[PDB]
Amino acid sequence: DPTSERWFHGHLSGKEAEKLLTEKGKHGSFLVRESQSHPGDFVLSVRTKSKVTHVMIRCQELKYDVGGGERFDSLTDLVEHYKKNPMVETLGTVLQLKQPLNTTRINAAEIESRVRELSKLAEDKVKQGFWEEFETLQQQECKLLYSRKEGQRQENKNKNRYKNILPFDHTRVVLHDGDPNEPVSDYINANIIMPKKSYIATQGCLQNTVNDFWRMVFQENSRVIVMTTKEVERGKSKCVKYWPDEYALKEYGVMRVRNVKESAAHDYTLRELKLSKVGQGNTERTVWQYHFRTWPDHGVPSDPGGVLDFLEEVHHKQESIMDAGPVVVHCSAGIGRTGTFIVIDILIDIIREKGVDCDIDVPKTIQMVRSQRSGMVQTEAQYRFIYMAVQHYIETLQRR
């Protein structure tokens, strides 16, 4: 632990660093690494005909220098030196050290250190570190423009709650058996999310898509639904009730749904729904609806403790059913709260398998999720909550 700054990536291979600079960085981006060839020493990787240069740094008696010149007492002073006194590469390219490439990989057991550092003001020091990580993603969202022609069709205009929140065509959920009396019948504002596990992120049902929604649940073999919104939030409707009252039977087109039993918790309510198709016998599936009804709209839940307990119940219910389809998650647009909960669940699965000493990367996981649905995780508050969720989960595993 020579420095605390995030431009120190620790153990990172030279070959691997050439990718992070070429993809997540611009001209003049730099980063320091642990030397793979010479233990104890370090490497300074700078991007610049986009090239990556590897400047090797020596560590003699805790003194740093690049082969020759004045020797520094700390590695952070060395970086500041060659930022105002640039070096010249052998290919005539001057190494302009403009912006650092802050790291995003963190050892799960060492997450508290990253949260405590992201809370410091990041350099002129107008916002915290969480803000800079969150804008690094919103900036890299431009290199993420896939086609969305199916969502923009005239036939599907009334099937989308928001005109500019549409599903990608290469991950869209395509409905097969539909109604020939419809210009288009295979479209629902939803996407399949894959890191074993897969999720379905969809919008809150409109009045004219309740029937389509259940045609997706039945088609996809889904047995668990996670609703993360109330029916109404401050006068505005965020999701029409697509399930029937308890002990009631409602028919949604070719589909049949019965609310057998409900279980109430302070943060959520569990509804046991039996889903069948009209006229077809022994097609009845039990769909579990977990309705989280204490999540504010653009805010975050009160404590990560209630969300993680809720989160674990979804996990156990999924594995208790044999060969259950993807888990259907939806808020109102299926973007902010939906992504936050999916992003958390993906990370917890990484921890369930590898343990507390694994490498987590929340931006890399969010960006990997955003390539499958537009702009998952909406606000910065939700972004900080993901860390606060993992940290609270790591702490519980460390006790006992």
Author numbering: 106 to 153, 164 to 238, 241 to 312, 324 to 528
Give the article text:
The full-length, wild-type SHP2 (FL-WT) contains three domains: a protein tyrosine phosphatase domain (PTP) and two preceding Src homology 2 domains (N-SH2 and C-SH2). The binding of a phosphotyrosine peptide to the opposing face of the N-SH2 domain exposes the catalytic cleft to substrate and activates the system. In diseases caused by SHP2, mutations are often observed at the N-SH2/PTP interface (e.g., E76D/E76K), resulting in constitutively active protein and abnormal cellular proliferation.
Therefore, we used a truncated SHP2 lacking the N-SH2 domain (ΔN-SH2; residues 104–529). As a single point mutation at the N-SH2/PTP interface (E76K) results in opening, we predicted that the ∆N-SH2 would resemble the completely open structure, albeit crystallizable. We then crystallized and solved the ∆N-SH2 structure at 2.9 Å. Remarkably, each structure shows an approximate 120° rotation of the C-SH2 and PTP domain with respect to the auto-inhibited structure. The hinge motion of the C-SH2 domain is achieved by changes in the main-chain torsion angles of residues L216, N217, and T218 in the linker region. A rotation, and not a detachment, of the C-SH2 domain results in a distinct C-SH2/PTP interface, which is stabilized by several electrostatic interactions within the C-SH2/PTP interdomain linker. However, in our four ΔN-SH2 molecules we observe both states. The WPD loop (chains B and C) is displaced 10 Å from the surface of the protein to the out conformation, and overlays perfectly with FL-WT structure. In addition, the N-SH2 is far removed from the binding pocket in the open structure and reorientation of the C-SH2 completely disrupts the binding pocket.
